[PDB]
Amino acid sequence: MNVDLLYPDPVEEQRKHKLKRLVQGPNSYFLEIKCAGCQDIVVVYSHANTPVFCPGCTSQISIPTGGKCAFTSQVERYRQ
Amino acid sequence: MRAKWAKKRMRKLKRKRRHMKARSK
Amino acid sequence: PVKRRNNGRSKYNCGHTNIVRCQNCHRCVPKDKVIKRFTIRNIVDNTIADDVLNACVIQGFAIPKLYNKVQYCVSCSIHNHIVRVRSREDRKIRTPPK
Amino acid sequence: VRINVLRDALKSICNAQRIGKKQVIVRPSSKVIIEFLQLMQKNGYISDFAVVDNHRSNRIVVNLIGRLNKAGVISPRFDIPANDIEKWVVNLLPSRLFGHIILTTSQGIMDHIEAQHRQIGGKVIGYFY
Amino acid sequence: AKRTKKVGLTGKYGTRYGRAARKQLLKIETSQKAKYTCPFCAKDKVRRTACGIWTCRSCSKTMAGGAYSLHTEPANAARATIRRLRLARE
Amino acid sequence: GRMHSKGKGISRSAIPYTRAPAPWNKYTPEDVCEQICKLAKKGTPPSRIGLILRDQFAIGQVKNVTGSKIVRILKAKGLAPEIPEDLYCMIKKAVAIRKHLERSRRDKDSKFRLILVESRIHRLARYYRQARRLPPTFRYKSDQAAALLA
């Protein structure tokens, strides 16, 4: 263990609170889900709470949850 | 409860002292 | 000085608990400061248990158990020996004896 | 709320030294904190310190060498007349020879000895001995 | 402009009739002369023509009511019962 | 902690270090501005415009993709709300509690939570008039609050 506070461990940081990390940063990412109907992927927010609609479909494709959004229909997460 | 009984005795005597002042003035 | 940290009652995150009556002394004690011992005794005495079963006509009968929760005040408990004055170190021991 | 940025910093350094921790982090970084620490680095009481940028108040990772004994702030910062500096040094610091009193001056943040040589006085930021 | 500190409309009775009677009357006579909201035209114009009789000045509707209040507390409880019991039948 | 309760929670949103548009971003700053204007015409509160742009669209922080925060863009086009959203939402809560109390005279707890809400309204309004945001004359009145909402 020669690890220093100045250069913090990379994977250790994600075990800390976002605010208490050496640099405050988002714990959320934008995923590129693939809607079953359209071959084109749809950018989605990881912790989405508002209704999100897949382009070309009239059904909400996001089930809102306490934290990270769950996705109602078949989707390919393809995080990007 | 001597301290509570002391304040009961005090209140009773101040009530009486008020009655005497009510008889006067 | 302060003999016990719990103050003699388990009141945490609370300003007021329910009132229980000591069964022997009929006093009002808070729920936290109560003996609360739950006892399951068989309805009959164990001396008369086997002879009741022999007498019982019903086959496969099981003797009823009596389930009761005896709650007492500190005075109505130390005098019945349900709880005992302990040494200052022994007082800290929270584990039930036996 | 967080009225004094420097007090929390020098407390979080003294606590770390007592534990024996080599490096510590200060949650809010001020320009006056950097000037107080810079004075301690030019007096040998501290080691390298690096201000990370969080795009807000900023953090400071401070390296220590066990050399520092006590670091504090005088609040409210009382303006000290030039002839009053010595009376402060006779109570705040142990020994007229060792210690430092950090006072903000019109010339800049300076130790009591530097202020005495320039023959000017100023508001006391704090002290490190 | 605060003509009397404690007695309100009871200043009419001067020093006579006691303190207890004047306190009860203060509350009773404030309700009797109060303007209540019309149940029909939703305007605060209802005034007491007679005991048990209240007329909306604007609505022109005359309603049966409590002697000193357009609505008595017993009566409001009775209304709630009848509405619930009628709904229970249907 | 909380101004009106002894709560010490720290939940907050931590915006990213880099002030960059997203690599997948294909929305020009003007294109995002049109979306902000469109939702505001439909009456979306400024906070909810940002949530829609975060979720249906890909704009995590509007400030990064555009050059300014949502209310500043709304102000330029003149479609900003007259009373700030924060003050407006608090006024709505007071109107709700006052309406519920006209049927619940014995509800002391809701009255306590009406004192707290109206103290917060006076303190935020006092700031907004000193900040020249609100007309100096603007003084919240319990009785006329309900009509003012529209």
Added chain:
Amino acid sequence: SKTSGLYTARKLRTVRRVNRWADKKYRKAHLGTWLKANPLEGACMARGIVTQKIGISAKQPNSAVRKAVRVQLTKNSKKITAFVPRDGSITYIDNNDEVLVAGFGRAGRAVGDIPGCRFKVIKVAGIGLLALFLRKREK
């Protein structure tokens, strides 16, 4: 806790003025109730005519008869009780013969086994009591 703001001098000055009164000594120095109450009225000592020679018992556990004189102070017509110090000194003091009385030395408190005597005679008929005891001057 105390208040430490660069502009809170006014509060500290008020707090000191208010809490100065809690000490009995500041009150017995500045309230002025003592000056009116004292039969010496702030004088180093007072003069007054003897009215009664009284034998005052000592407080327990001491058992003795302390010897004192009741004195009406010419200055304020106020009768005090003053111990006459030393052995057989009372014989020098007659009735109505004028005595100069000073306090005991506890600043107005009764001292020793003697109760309520806050004063002691220093000069009888213009003659120092200690001198009449050492037989330096006759009565």
Added chain:
RNA sequence: CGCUGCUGCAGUUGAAACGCCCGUAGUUGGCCCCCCGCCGCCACGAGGAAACGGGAGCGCUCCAGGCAGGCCCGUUGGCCCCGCCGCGUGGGACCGCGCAGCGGGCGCGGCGCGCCGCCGCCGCAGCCCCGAGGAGAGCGGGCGGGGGCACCGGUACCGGCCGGGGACGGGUGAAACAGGAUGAUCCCGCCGAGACCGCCGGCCGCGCAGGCGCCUGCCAAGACCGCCUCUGUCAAUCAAGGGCGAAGGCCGGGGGCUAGAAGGCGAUCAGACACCACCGUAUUCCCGGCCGUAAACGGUGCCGCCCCGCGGCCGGCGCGCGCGUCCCGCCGGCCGCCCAGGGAAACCGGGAGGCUCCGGGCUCUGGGGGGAGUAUGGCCGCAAGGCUGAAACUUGAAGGCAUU
């Protein structure tokens, strides 16, 4: 005498954190722009009586003194202190505050400008620190005896009624007083009345405290968590002021099952108008108010920072993993033990730590023990009482914690 505490006091238990919450005055407010104006600020000057207090030099014989002296600076008697909150100069770190577009040309305005007007005039990067492990607002998700109202269930208690059966029941520690052939007690059916919500029920949870547990709805909330949502310091603590506040009490309406201040009885005892038995009024319960207090306690104000391990529980969320109400975190809460450290010690250790090595901000209270929370005056309440609150006078201890 750090027993008045600015330096520099104390408030868990010795004296002492206001029962709670909001909140004005007041005091206090994170970070940020070098270079500009105002402020305070520090330095240095001017100018304003000496004496005094220092203090240069001088042997009144020393000395307290005095300004003397000795062929001597033009012999001296210098110089400082007049807190001087004013003024002048310099600095500009800290400390607060700063709203306007600028610039060119007309223009040299009526002896040089400046204001003002006038043209886009074409010069100008013309104009937004940021987004606090500050605060508020939102969205989503669960959370809980949080709150109001209506509804409703269940026994138990007590009263009534039908039957049955027969003699003693009650009550105690032992009795006794009442209860009974007008059939008690006991058993069962049934009915009325009001209270109350068991076991589950807790080192559970919620609430600002006081407090909060039947069912079924209705209504408005709140913390917490998650978040690349909005705002941009809106904040902290708080005299006065507003609201809340167990129980008992009081004032009107009701209601009245239980228990039960008073009262009455039967015992006890030396006495007993106490404890215990028995009967029972106010009260207990609801609605609309008063009251304004509790050992209202964590006997520990509030907001903020850091601090050492080890476990338990509760709520939300994330990570692995077959995949489990696992595991490892994170955040908020409630806790137990405790390393230092602190303390007179008990103990605290999520502080009572980071403190004679003493200074983050704010409010409140105490200053030996009585007298005395008395007196008097005020305010408040219908009253009971609340709140504010002496002195004379007395006394040498009162008190804390620990050891025997």
